Each structure stands twice: as structure tokens, then as C-alpha cells.
Symmetry: C3
Subunit: 360 residues, 3 copies
């Protein structure tokens, strides 16, 4: 009916699944069950039992298999029926759909592919250096649902230079995109507007914000943020990721970790990190207010100061065709820098005009 993106998708944080009860996720137009085996590893299958349609997510784990609450059949992490407890044997074709998993960076990922193939080794989610380490906090994480929109409308932001001023209240002084293979990257530097105070990580006019944000596949973005304040620089890592529930609904997730400042107690270091982590969340929530309130546009009208929207969408298209049909122009290295001079000039004028009105 409706085609979902081939790639890694994060279903949430490991710590929310290791408990070791089963969990339901509505995703990819169906329902999924997540459960830990006896060795604590996570498994993902279609939630609905292939016997008579019982809900495996409402079952319990027994050994290394999930047990259906209707007639107690047992399904393992590869989708195989390991036992029908009241029958001599298992019909030889007792198999359901199993999703390949990846546990990394304190998160759970599943591989989706309509063609039914496994993830190739060169398509993965990178290890975030610093995670699982006293130096860095643990994820502050949040989640919501957006309806009436596509996943792609989030991805469109990769190339959106102008919204940094209007939505994040900052001047994007450097802005560059690089699309290559199965990744899409935004590099940008900003300083905060003097005519606005809102407690985000974009706020400070005295600090330069340096951002490198990359989609590792269609659904998962890691944004490395450095805020140079005084001599010292605050390092954070923001995750922006999504997965489709249906053709018309998706889950959007975002989380932050902050690097602890050294030569200070834990009480104070962990308290200030949390303080900055909230600022990052608030920045992200500025995008959310737009994303919850906007129509899709297949044929956007573009200005000379727009980022490379059509090339971004071309790159993204690779994840919605069969791998044999992916073309060179989708995956070949493409880069584009916007000279932000004109925009910043317009913006600095406007901000000066505001500041003049603020006093007199």
C-alpha cells in the first residue's frame, strides 16, 4: 500500500526495554513486540501471533522466547516457534517476521527493509564516543507523535538555513550541506540574537555555537554541538530521530547528553549539565512547534537563499526505491555552501531596528 524507508530506526532507549517484560511499539503500519531474552539481549517481532492472532506484547517472556497469552506458543528472536507446549511438535513452517536489532549508544535500533534483506555491514549507526562514561551524562529523552505529516518534512530541515533566525533566534554565520552515500550533513555556526532572550542553547550572543548534524540513514540524526563560552567550550550531543507509525503518523524522538565540566564536584557538574541539557531540549521544541503546524509541500517555492532542497530529497529518495534502482545522483558526494552574508545583513538590520524600538 504505502512504502516505508529502508534503514535503521531507533525505537527508544535500552533502559526502557530492559525490565524484562514485553513492550509494544506501533510502527511500520503494524504492531511490534520488544522483549529481552535470558541473556538480557533485546528481540523484536511482529506483535500478532501467527496461530490465531493473539497479542505477544501482552504475553510474558519464558527463557529466550516470548509466550503468547492466548495459547502460550513460544517465539524466539529470529521469529521461530520454539514450542507449542501442549503439542508433540511444531508445524514445520512456524515462522513470524523478526526484525534485526542493534543495541548501541544506549538505544535500540531496528532494520526496516521492504525487500526483506538484512542490513549490510557498511550501513550502520556509529558509536558515539563519550557515551557510557563518567565524563558524559545519560540521555534526557522525550517523545511525541505527529499526525497529518510525513517523515520527510523533518528531514527537510537539514538544508534550512533561514529558520535558525526565525525559529531558533540566532544568526547562522556559516552554513554548509554535504550529502554522500547514505548520510546527509549540515554544518553551521551561529551567534544568538541580542533582541531576544529564550533559554535555549542558541541564545547567547557572546558565544559561538558550532553544529555538525548528520543523518545516518533516513531516520536517525546525531548533532554534535559545541558552545564556545569564555575560554571554555560546552560539548553536547543531540539526537533527532523518527519512525513511521502509519503512512499518516510518526513518532519523533529527541535526546541530549552533555559533557561534565571537570575540576568541580559531581553535585554541581551534574546539575549544570542538566541545566544546559534543558536548553537543548527547548531549542528542539521550537522546531516541533513548526512541525506540528505545517502542510507538506511537494513543489516548494525556493528563494536564492534556500538550501539544496531538491538534492536533499533526491538523496532521501534512495531509501524508498529498491537498492538495485538507486542511481549515482542519489549517492554521489554533493556539497553546497550558502553564503549567509545577505541574510545576516538583512537580519542584523532588522534586529538593530528592534533594539532601537526597545529603548526608545
Amino acid at each position: 500500500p504505502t512504502r516505508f524507508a529502508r534503514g535503521w530506526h531507533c525505537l527508544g532507549l535500552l533502559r526502557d526495554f530492559q525490565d524484562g517484560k514485553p513492550h509494544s511499539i506501533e510502527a511500520f503500519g503494524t504492531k511490534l513486540v520488544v522483549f529481552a531474552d535470558s541473556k538480557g539481549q533485546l528481540n523484536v517481532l511482529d506483535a500478532y501471533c501467527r496461530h490465531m492472532g493473539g497479542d505477544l506484547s501482552r504475553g510474558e517472556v519464558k527463557g529466550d522466547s516470548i509466550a503468547c497469552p492466548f495459547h502460550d506458543w513460544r517465539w524466539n528472536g529470529k521469529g521461530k516457534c520454539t514450542d507449542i507446549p501442549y503439542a508433540r511438535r511444531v508445524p514445520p513452517i512456524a515462522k513470524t517476521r523478526a526484525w534485526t536489532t542493534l543495541e548501541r549508544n544506549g538505544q535500540l535500533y531496528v532494520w526496516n527493509d521492504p525487500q526483506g534483506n538484512p542490513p549490510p555491514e557498511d550501513v550502520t549507526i556509529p558509536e558515539i564516543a563519550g557515551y557510557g562514561t563518567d565524563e558524559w551524562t545519560d540521555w534526557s529523552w522525550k517523545s511525541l507523535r505527529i499526525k497529518g505529516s510525513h517523515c520527510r518534512e523533518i528531514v527537510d530541515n537539514v538544508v534550512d538555513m533561514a529558520h535558525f533566525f526565525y525559529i531558533h533566534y540566532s544568526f547562522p554565520r556559516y552554513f554548509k550541506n554535504v550529502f554522500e552515500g547514505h548520510t546527509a550533513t549540515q554544518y553551521m555556526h551561529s551567534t544568538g540574537r541580542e533582541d531576544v532572550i529564550s533559554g535555549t542553547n542558541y541564545d547567547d550572543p557572546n558565544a559561538e555555537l558550532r553544529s555538525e548534524a548528520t543523518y545516518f540513514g533516513p531516520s536517525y540524526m546525531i548533532d554534535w554541538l559545541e558552545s564556545d563560552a569564555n575560554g571554555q567550550t560546552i560539548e553536547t550531543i543531540l539526537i533527532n530521530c523518527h519512525y513511521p507509525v502509519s503512512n499518516n503518523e510518526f513518532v519523533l524522538q529527541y535526546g541530549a547528553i552533555v559533557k561534565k565540566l571537570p575540576g568541580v564536584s559531581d553535585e554541581i557538574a551534574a546539575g549544570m549539565a542538566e541545566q544546559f541539557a534543558e536548553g537543548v531540549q527547548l531549542g528542539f521544541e521550537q522546531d516541533v512547534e513548526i512541525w506540528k503546524n505545517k502542510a507538506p509541500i511537494d513543489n516548494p517555492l525556493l528563494s536564492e537563499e534556500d538550501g539544496p532542497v531538491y538534492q536533499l530529497r533526491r538523496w532521501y529518495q534512495q531509501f524508498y526505491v529498491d537498492v538495485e534502482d538507486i542511481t549515482e545522483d542519489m549517492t554521489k558526494r554533493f556539497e553546497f555552501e550558502i553564503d549567509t552574508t545577505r541574510a545576516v545583513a538583512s537580519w542584523q538590520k532588522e534586529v538593530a531596528e528592534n533594539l532601537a524600538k526597545q529603548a526608545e
Copy 2:
């Protein structure tokens, strides 16, 4: 997909739009923004910005243009992009859909037409003599949504003689329809039932109610009501109008103004007018109870005492075909009078039977 009526449609009262923030209206299967320019005149455009789909209704007005809250592009009342503030020029094709407006009788109207043409001069909404005048009150106005029905099911009432007895508790003693060009008219006179007391303008058995109600196009009806009580006659004007939200939902609006009785103080004159205005609203709300609870019928079964339903629907059909395809039988003057003698005889009998039971 689904075709909406060509014609003037009232979106509400001017005073609710002159404030001068933007307003959203869900109508004609899309979302609209209404906003005042610097000279206070109202403008209507599609709400969704043609750049990347931001919601203009959630923006602000700047001069004579609405400003998108996503990247601040500026759109004027003719749908032209007047400025991209951070870019040198406006792409030469920067245009969105603009709706032609009419401000009159303290209300805002928009012209809808699938063929995309402007309103011809001979198709308009007449000036209501008496509006904007100390002699007459201002609109008491109300609004609601009806789902699971068509606009046409409201229009069907033009020819419904019998419902005056069952729904408005009155005897329709005179009843006539005239359809002509783009108007459809109901003339009727009534007196109230003695066996029922409910505080509507149809209630009084001693007063004769005279009504002339005309659809000026497919969506907007003005009903001139005169209630002859004693020597003196109370004059009111009721509006019944609608506009479609989707193929399956519409907004129904109704409002009243009353002429102030002279030779009395303002406190008392304005207080009694309001008193009568409520009676009119209550009468209208009797129709609403039916309209919220009734199925559409494409092939109604008709009695010898029904009004000219098929001719009414034929007239109405003109608004759902292209102007080149409108036929003579749709627009040619048609009139039909129901002789209400038989019905009134049946009704007066039944009412007498009730009154006999009331006492003994």
C-alpha cells in the same frame, strides 16, 4: 475530488476579524487565513505558505501583507509574495490562491468558484437596509458544525411547508416559492398554535407572522420577518447561511437584528429588541435539532402537500456545474403556491383534539 458550490459564502462577522490579528477558517477542503491590511480592509488567502508549508494563520500582519511564521515571507491580499526579507528578489512565480472578498451588512463574504473566475457584478449580496443604523440592533450571531450531511439538506427547507407546524409550532396559512436566476425565495404567513407555548417568534396565536426568505446564491439566506402584534408590527431580519468545511462537514451560521421600537428609552428599547432576538434564535434552533439528526435523501418520497423539491434541487444544481453548462430550466422563473387549506384543516382538528384533552 468533491465539488463545492460556486458563490458568495459568509465567513462570519466583520467585528470578529478586525482586530487586526490573523484568523484561520477551515473551509472548502482547505485552511484559510483572514487578515486586515494597514487600511483595515480584510484579505483571504490559503493558509499554507507556498514556500515550505508554514501556517500563515499563525503569523502576523506587517503592513499590507501577512507574514509567515516559519521564514517570514510576506503575502498580500491578492496572493502575491511582496517580500522575502533575507533575499534580494522574489522568485517571479511567487503567487498563492487569493479569495475575492466582500464586506457588507457587517459580515465578510468570499467568492468560491472551482473554475477560478471572479464574481460577476450581477451576482452579489444585497445591502440590508436598516443595518448600521440606530434604529436597528447589531447582530446576535451563533455558529456550529454539522457532520455527516450536505449543505443541500439545509437548502431543502426553502420548500418545506409542513415543518412549520411540527417543528415551529405554527400554522402556515400562506406558502409560496419563487426560483429565478441565482435566487430562491420562500414567502409564508403563519399564526401560532394555541396548544403549545415555546418562546419563539412563531409562538403567538394572536399575531400574524409574515416571512420573506431568499437565498442569494447557494449559501446565504436573508429572512425578512414581520410580526403584526396589536396595531404595531415588530420587524426582524434573520440570516441563515453556511459554508462547507469538507465534503462531509459544514459550518452553519445564524444571526438576527431587530428594529428598535420608538418613543421609548434606549435601555427599554434595546432590552426588548434583545428579548425578541432570542425568540428568533430559538426558532432557528428548532431546525438545527432536525438538521443534526437526519439522513440525506437523494430520492425523497413526496406527498401532494410537499413543496417543489425537485425544482428547488434543479435550481441549486446550477451552482455545481460550469457556468457554460447551466440550462434554462435551472434559472428560468419558476413559481409554486401550496394551497395550505387541507393541511391547516388537518392541523386545526388535531390541535382542537389536544386542547379538548388539556382541559378534560
Copy 3:
């Protein structure tokens, strides 16, 4: 669009319809009105009036006809317009859809058939011996709606031997199905599990439960239950029935009557019957928890201990084809006994293992 089962369907208890106002039932993809005539007999018609679509369920009864609340036309139990009170005659084709009724066992049934034929005499609902009698209680009855599922998913339970252990906490020691003509029967005997206490009629490990449950057509099941406790045996009768609201929603109803134990006062006999009646309801509510939480399966994966699912569905299919197309294999007597030995052996082991853990 979507085809509903030909057969008797119970709309509820007679006592809820004899009052003698009209009642609406949403069923078979439309709305229905139920009303008592002057002799107290019940009538069922489409709710929407064939004049202009008024809601007959919101009308009142006048003599032997329901009166539309919009223009007061009168419709009798055979769907004929008996009067247009304000008109000389009734158009000669004034007919709406009438549903054939059956009042029996304190319940109201309607005959549905897409082919528009009347119920044949040999297809009926049997008189429940004991109903309407001091010896037996009156129906304790309950009702709910299930969405996202088909009627058939309830019917699938006829052949579900295994769920008695997992869902009703009992050992099915005897289990047999017989399908024949337009009936489908489940015979089973059980004893309760010692490792579980929940206050249902399946609970007692010391009592043998004997059940004979038969679908008399596609929608209505009567289950004769005998619980042999001590010397004395408790007799109950459970009804499980349904009717479709739409293709995607249905109403599920269940009720119980209990036979009063003799040689005891009424206060105590009626109090204990009610006590047992609740136990029966709780048992049924165990199925409801599964039925509210399960996906349809067109191609169920079956074990060697499954009941004859495909033959059951073949039998059921007769009610969704035209009577001329019903085949011998649908209606020919078919019987199947499951030898429950292996399952009970597995189950008794598992239960012993639990009991061992319970103590130590």
C-alpha cells in the same frame, strides 16, 4: 459494499424494548428503530424516514405505527406508510425496509438477509426450556462493542480446545465439535486448575463442568452448562451472541440464567443463583479480554491439537453466500473429537510444577 451474515440476530432483551417508546439500534451498516404497537408486539424498521430522512427512532408511537418527528408520517411494522396526516392520500409506493421479528426466550431477534427473503420455517431459534418459570432466574445481561475485528473471530472459539486451560483456567478433559446444517456445536467437559483461584464457573477442581454450546445460525449461541458439585448439580444457561454494526465493528452480548435450588427460601435461592450467575459472567469476560486484543488471521497456523478451524469456517461461509450457492460440504454433518490426553498431560505437569513452587 460489505456483506453481512444471513440469519437470526438478537438485538437485546424484550424488557428493554417494551416501554413503549422507540429505540435506535445501529446495525447492519444502518440505523434501526424498534417500537411496540398497541398490542405490545415489537416492530423493526430502518430508522431513517423515506420522506426527507427524519429519524424515526426520535419519534413517538401512535397506535400501531411509528410517527416521524419531522413531518409526522406514520409507518407500520411491515414498513408501510399508514398515514400522511395533512394529506388526502399516501403515495402508492410509500414503503420502507421492515425487518422480520421473533420474540422468544425474553429476547428480540431480527432476520437479516441480503437477498431480501423471509426466514424459512426450519431456520429458527429454539425455545429454551426453563425460561419464564419460577424455577429459573431472569437474564443477567451485558453488552459491549468491539472494533477492528470481525464477527467470525468470536465464532472461531467453537473449536478452541486449548484456550480453556490458558484463558479459563481449567482442563478440558472431553472436547468434541459437530457441524450440521445451520448449527455448530461444541461439547466439552472440564475440571478447574488447583494452581489458580478466580471466581468463575470453571474454577472448581472438585466439580466436573459439562458444557453443550451451539450456534443456531451465524450469530447466536446457547451454552447449556452443568456443574456437578457434591451430589447436586448446578444448571445454568449462557447466551453468547453478536450482531454487526459496520464491516469493522460489532456488538457482543452475553447473558445468564440459573436454575434455583429447591427446598430453600426464595431470599437464599435467588441470592445463590445470582452468586453463580456472576461466576459465569466472569468466565465470559476472560474471552472478552482476548477478543478485544487480537488480530484477525485468515491463514491460521494450526497445531495437531487445534480444533477443526477450516471446517468451522467452511460451515460459517454458508451464511455469506446466496442460498442457491451453498454446497454440501458446508452443511453436511461433520464431527471431530480431540483426544485431549497429550494436552492435559502437558498441562497437569506444568500445574504440578507451579504447585511445587507455590509451597517451596
